[PDB]
Design a protein around this ligand. Structure first.
Ligand SMILES: [NH3+][C@H]1CCc2ccccc2CC1(O)O
Ligand SMILES: [Cl-]
Ligand SMILES: [Cl-]
Ligand SMILES: [Cl-]
Ligand code: NA
Ligand code: NA
Ligand code: NA
Ligand code: NA
Ligand code: NA
Ligand code: NA
Ligand code: NA
Ligand code: NA
Ligand SMILES: [Zn+2]
Length: 868
């Protein structure tokens, strides 16, 4: 039988705590023997049994105070031990098999290395334990292994003992002084190259930094090391937080379901978020390494020193740590580009989740499989909620709140409500209504109407809000929405906001279903900028004229507003042209719209970083969110037609800006990255110029590129525009790079997202490619996941072939690696957003999956919601 849902309202403090655990691993890939000696204390009723979680363990023995115990039973997922004293020593010996662990949860093999992933509930795959994050224990870990195969034996904390044994084995013992929940346990065993460096904290603590990579990869490690030092310095400067241990280890592994993991003092990272060299990694890879290194470092305080009482509180650490990583990237780099791209993710991907059958509040109320809740909502919307607190409080108050949060909760497992209370108490800002953001799912819609009264020189905004019902929640209530505005006069000058002789804050508190805001001394009919810096995670309904939007593109003070105005301008014409496509009619675009983009190209005063984003059209997933019923073929074809029309109308300006932004030196420096992003944004359109001009330009860039950013931009353009050189360039890239999986992932993505008519045949054939394997999550995501999630036009082919392909892949992955399967099923659970014929085929696919033998809980949860 499938597992039953668990509910946030059922939280109960544990009947037993474990204060200290001494682990011994006698390591082997086929068989590992685990000995766990735990010091336990009863907190609950004297007759309560100890209920330990365990999965796929071979129990060898149970002792209580060294007495072999008879009062125990194994049940599904558990070991239940009765008749215990109030305080006692529990000793469990059990066996596990890392080589059999294809799910990559618990202790498993990554190539020749052994490594762990314990979040959320993986430690119970290692031993029988209280695998819940409000149980905080001091760990000591002894690792015994063959010395030749496993010369490095790592766990959390500091090395406290080591020895050698007969028959070529050796051992190391680690001690981590900070009590932790078991999801933060890590173990690594293998042979590695190690990059070693040092960071000295502002108070003088010297921290040894160690980055473990596969042999031969040292020259790909310096950027990650530099980013770790940058993260440590920034957390000191911005948050006043120092690292708290003596060593900081990071291990890069090739086989990893997640991007990275914040295990205390021993982070484990997917190699994608560590390894970089300029010929193999793009600017985006460099900035993603920076943000993920930062994210995991920032968890040391927001997640580790203060952890989560229960898994429904996941956003307590994830929303806050994502906010921290965004602030880090934004401070060091381009704040406008960071904000823009985070808003693209919110509007184009998280909004889709929040109206889907999987919709949940950032603090869920009901979960079947927790590892399904590591979501865009919990992370990205979670961060938007933190950012709204920051908007309401300001930086100084926000940092006072952080300080009070740590003062109260350091060394504990806390709740979202605890965090909000700390912010409220430190700042004196009332967040009682604001708390509804934690409990209500769905995207609010904010509708704005305006009126300018020339007789009284008053401007009035009438603002309404509503959240449509979602499948998880029938009751919706108004939220406390921080709604930032700016008003512009006819010369683009800001109009001071005031009423009754007093200044009015530009962040309006939209707290009611409907309310009005009156501003006086408004000497001219304003052009408003609304929802500035995306001040709340909402859909905005305001009846813009095209002229208001092009005005904002020329005059708005914040770069984000200029980009956002361009998005609103495009939205009207994307919608127009999708409707036209459905009636067989070609693209129609007023001249004045093309001219707004011409002006961006020719404006010497605009930051190239901003111009590049304005000249990057919304993705097909961003476009889908504009529509009640998604027509993925119309969207894809309109996106191409819009690209072609702009390429034709702007051909001379695009080429001039492309050439003007040429850089002979390659540097991973923000100003250079911006110029390159602008040059390559122009290239996307130039690829749709006259076929031969485009073919020459694109092939030249590919062959002359001195860095992977420019080479991949050219290759992507050859695929997108189906240029003559495409097949030759794609083969050259394969021949050069086939032994490098991270580099080939880029090529698999291009294959999977190709506009070619035969894309599915190509994708299917690539299941046999020398660089592809179903054993590697990165390869799976880059080929299969990109097809289903990033090529909706082909995934939603009207013959249903895309659904049948995904069913085949999920039939394999349901058994092999359910976490990856559950990420890959997401496109099918969006069926109610599609036309009836597509829904019928998608339902049939889901019903096939529902009937699988040994259906994983991961997929069961999503399938059940989708078929309801
Ligand atoms: N705590 C981990 C959990 C794994 C995971 C899943 C989804 C996005 C990011 C991450 C990285 C993380 O650091 O947040
Ligand atoms: Cl073995
Ligand atoms: Cl590696
Ligand atoms: Cl700005
Ligand atoms: Na004892
Ligand atoms: Na910055
Ligand atoms: Na589970
Ligand atoms: Na997981
Ligand atoms: Na009006
Ligand atoms: Na208006
Ligand atoms: Na302001
Ligand atoms: Na292969
Ligand atoms: Zn995280």
């Amino acid at each position: 039988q499938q597992p039953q849902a668990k509910y946030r309202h059922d939280y109960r403090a544990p009947d037993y705590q474990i204060t200290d655990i001494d682990l011994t691993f006698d390591l082997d890939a086929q068989k590992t023997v685990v000995t766990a000696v735990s010091q336990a204390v009863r907190h609950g009723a004297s007759d309560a049994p100890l209920r330990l979680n365990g999965e796929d363990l071979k129990l060898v023995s149970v002792h209580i105070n060294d007495e072999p115990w008879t009062a125990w039973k194994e049940e599904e997922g558990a070991l239940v031990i009765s008749n215990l004293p109030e305080r006692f020593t529990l000793k469990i010996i059990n066996e596990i098999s890392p080589a059999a662990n294809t799910a990559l949860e618990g202790l498993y093999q990554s190539g020749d290395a052994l490594c762990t992933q314990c979040e959320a509930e993986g430690f119970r795959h290692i031993t029988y334990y209280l695998d819940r994050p409000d149980v905080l224990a001091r760990f000591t870990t002894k690792i015994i292994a063959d010395k030749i195969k496993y010369p490095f034996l790592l766990s959390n904390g500091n090395r406290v003992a080591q020895g050698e044994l007969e028959n070529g084995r050796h051992w190391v013992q680690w001690q981590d002084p900070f009590p932790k929940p078991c999801y933060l346990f890590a173990l690594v065993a293998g042979d590695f190259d190690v990059l070693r460096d040092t960071f000295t904290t502002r108070s003088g603590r010297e921290v040894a930094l160690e980055l473990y990579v596969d042999r031969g990869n040292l020259d790909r490690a310096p950027w990650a090391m530099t980013s770790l030092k940058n993260s440590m310095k920034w957390d000191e400067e911005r948050f006043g937080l120092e690292y708290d241990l003596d060593i900081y280890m990071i291990v890069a592994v090739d086989f990893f379901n997640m991007g990275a993991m914040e295990n205390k003092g021993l982070n484990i990272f997917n190699s994608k978020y560590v390894l970089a060299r300029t010929d193999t990694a793009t600017d985006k890879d460099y900035l993603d390494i920076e943000r993920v290194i930062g994210h995991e470092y920032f968890h040391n305080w927001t997640g580790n020193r203060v952890t989560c009482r229960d898994w429904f509180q996941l956003s307590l650490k994830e929303g806050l740590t994502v906010f921290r990583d965004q602030e880090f990237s934004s401070d060091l780099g381009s704040r406008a580009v960071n904000r823009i791209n985070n808003v693209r993710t919110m509007r184009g991907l998280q909004f889709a989740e929040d109206a889907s059958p999987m919709a949940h509040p950032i603090r869920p109320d009901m979960v079947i499989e927790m590892n399904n809740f590591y979501t865009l909502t919990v992370y990205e919307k979670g961060a938007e909620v933190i950012r709204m607190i920051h908007t309401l409080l300001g930086e100084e108050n926000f940092q006072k709140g952080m300080q009070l949060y740590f003062e109260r909760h350091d060394g504990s497992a806390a709740t979202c409500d605890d965090f909000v209370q700390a912010m409220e108490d430190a700042s004196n800002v009332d967040l009682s209504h604001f708390r509804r953001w934690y409990s209500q799912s769905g995207t609010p819609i904010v509708t704005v109407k305006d009126d300018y009264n020339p007789e009284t020189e008053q401007y009035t905004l009438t603002i309404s809000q509503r959240t449509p019902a979602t499948p998880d929640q029938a009751e919706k209530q108004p939220l406390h929405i921080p709604f930032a505005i700016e008003l512009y006069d006819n010369e683009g000058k800001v109009i001071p906001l005031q009423k009754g002789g007093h200044p009015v804050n530009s962040v309006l508190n939209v707290t009611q279903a409907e309310q009005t805001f009156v501003f006086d001394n408004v000497y001219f009919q304003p052009v408003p900028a609304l929802l500035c810096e995306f001040s709340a995670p909402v859909k905005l309904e305001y009846k813009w004229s095209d002229q208001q939007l092009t005005f904002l593109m020329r005059h708005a003070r914040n770069d984000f507003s200029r980009w956002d105005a361009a998005q609103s301008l495009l939205a009207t014409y994307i919608k127009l042209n999708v409707a036209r496509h459905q009636q067989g009619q070609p693209l129609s675009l007023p001249v004045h719209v093309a001219d707004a983009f011409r002006a961006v190209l020719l404006d010497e005063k605009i930051d190239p970083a901003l111009a590049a984003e304005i000249l990057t059209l919304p993705s097909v997933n961003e476009m889908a969110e504009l529509f009640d019923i998604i027509d993925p073929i119309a969207i894809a074809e309109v996106r191409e037609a819009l690209t072609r029309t702009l390429a034709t109308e702007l051909a001379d300006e695009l080429l001039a800006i492309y050439n003007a932004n040429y850089q002979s030196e390659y540097r991973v420096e923000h100003e250079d990255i911006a110029k390159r992003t602008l040059r390559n944004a122009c290239l996307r359109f130039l690829a749709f110029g006259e076929t031969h001009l485009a073919d020459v330009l694109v092939s030249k860039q590919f062959h002359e590129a001195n860095n992977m950013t420019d080479a991949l931009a050219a290759l992507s353009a050859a695929v997108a525009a189906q240029l003559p050189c495409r097949d030759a360039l794609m083969q050259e890239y394969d021949d050069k790079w086939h032994q490098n999986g991270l580099v080939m992932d880029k090529w698999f993505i291009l294959q999977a997202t190709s506009p070619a008519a035969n894309v599915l045949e190509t994708v299917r054939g690539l299941l046999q490619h020398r660089s592809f394997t179903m054993s590697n999550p990165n390869r799976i995501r880059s080929l299969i996941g990109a097809f289903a999630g990033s090529n909706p036009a082909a995934f939603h082919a009207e013959d249903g072939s895309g659904y049948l392909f995904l069913v085949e892949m999920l039939t394999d992955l349901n058994s092999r690696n359910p976490q990856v399967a559950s990420r890959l099923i997401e496109p099918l659970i969006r069926l109610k957003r599609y036309d009836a014929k597509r829904q019928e085929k998608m339902r049939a696919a889901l019903e096939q999956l529902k009937g699988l033998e040994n259906l994983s809980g991961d997929l069961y949860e999503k399938i059940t919601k989708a078929l309801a």
